[PDB]
Amino acid sequence: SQVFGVARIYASFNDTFVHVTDLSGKETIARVTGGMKVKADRDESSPYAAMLAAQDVAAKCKEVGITAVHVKIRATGGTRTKTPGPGGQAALRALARSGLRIGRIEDVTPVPSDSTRKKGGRRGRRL
Amino acid sequence: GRMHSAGKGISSSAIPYSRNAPAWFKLSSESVIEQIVKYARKGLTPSQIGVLLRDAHGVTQARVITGNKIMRILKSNGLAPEIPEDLYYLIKKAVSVRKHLERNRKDKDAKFRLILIESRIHRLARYYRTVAVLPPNWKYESATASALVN
């Protein structure tokens, strides 16, 4: 009695992505992100901007017809961070508190099986 | 120890104090002597003759049962190999690595082992030539090594 979707909350530094997706994965609804709500270019990944971004993703989905979604929070992955962004957990709370029920949270960050090389050199990002 | 390795493990045989043994033995000295040559007649090396006589028969060691040792008995009855047994196996191992190194040339570990085996063979050959067991002009030839093992 409840149509379902997928959140795909991409959480990283300097940016955050909330892109609601249907069960199959081809359809795209409300790809709004946290970089089109802030006017600082430093708070794009901040928790204060993810909440604003997710406040619109939960309204467009409701207008479209989606009432509940699944959550797959992910990070940059690859060989760069492997850790969730500062505002990924805030984005999940924003659409949960907007009346959009959630369920089955999954971590789909791409962990490599020792592939390619990591940028920075052998002496590190000396700053 | 371990002439050609870094190991230091100690492991050997501890023969008993009784030079007249094992008391419960009942077979005669001649009976075990004809058993030694029978096993030597079928190509068994002196080490295998002692091994087989120790675990299958009641012969603890062939020195206290007989008056002489296994190699000594083999030479007396005319079943002595031309080349020493230990040298024979060392050359047999050496040609095995050479056969391995003639197809897989990129094996540097085998090359290092082959040098160690060849050096060990030369050192053993020097003693045997000095002790007047091998011909004074005997030498280890890589091409002829395979033929020497027969």
Partner: protein, 226 residues
């Protein structure tokens, strides 16, 4: 960055969800509660149509939802859409994948990870690569806190795991294999066969991903969705 973009269009309105229609998904008869869900698709037009654009689709769901119970939550079943029947897309088994939460949970340290895989073709010509996992366990009364293996039992159990998976897959169809993984009877078979080598724990099959699909055979599909 709403006011930092300089070049927005180098070359020089209607909401797109009005031309999209809901389609209700269905699952094989292996899973009890079919009840998959709904998906968007562009309206059937004369140029591309909706069936062609919906023919190729793989929807990922969780086995706990399909079977109703909760002991299959860590297993998610991937179903591939391959044919429609007028507003109810029909799927088929495509793969099985252990969730990242569970997989990283059983993987601990001070224990040995035994892994194996097999490439086996079923009766219906479905070339499948089946993965399996196993972890050594600390037996009761043991005080040594490493519980490692000697790399020879690992090879022995790997051989037994490979032949067990080969036996239970060669001689059965994809539908039978799907009906076999859900009761987790394969895990019982492995723990019966590798209990005389090393205790082991958390015996599981990781992935049943698909490699080759046979001829379409719309007849089998109609039997799957009765």
């Amino acid at each position: 960055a709403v006011g930092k973009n300089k070049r927005l269009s180098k070359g020089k309105v209607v909401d797109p969800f009005t031309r999209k229609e809901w389609f209700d998904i269905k699952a094989p008869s292996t899973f009890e509660n079919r009840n998959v869900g709904k998906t968007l698709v562009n309206k059937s037009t004369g140029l591309k149509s909706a069936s062609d654009a919906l023919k190729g689709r793989v929807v990922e769901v969780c086995l706990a939802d399909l079977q109703g119970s909760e002991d299959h939550s860590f297993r998610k079943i991937k179903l591939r859409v391959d044919e429609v029947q007028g507003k109810n897309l029909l799927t088929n088994f495509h793969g099985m994948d252990f969730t990242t939460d569970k997989l990283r949970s059983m993987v601990r340290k001070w224990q040995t990870l035994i892994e194996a895989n097999v490439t086996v073709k079923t009766s219906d010509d479905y070339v499948l690569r089946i993965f399996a996992i196993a972890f050594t366990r600390k037996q009761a009364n043991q005080v040594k806190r490493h519980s490692y293996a000697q790399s020879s039992h690992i090879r022995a159990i790997r051989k037994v795991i490979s032949e067990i998976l080969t036996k239970e897959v060669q001689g059965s169809t994809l539908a039978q294999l799907t009906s076999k993984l859900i009761p987790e009877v394969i895990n019982k078979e492995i723990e019966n066969a590798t209990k005389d080598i090393f205790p082991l724990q958390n015996i599981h099959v990781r992935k049943v991903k698909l490699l080759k699909q046979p001829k379409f055979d719309v007849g089998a599909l109609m039997a799957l969705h009765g």
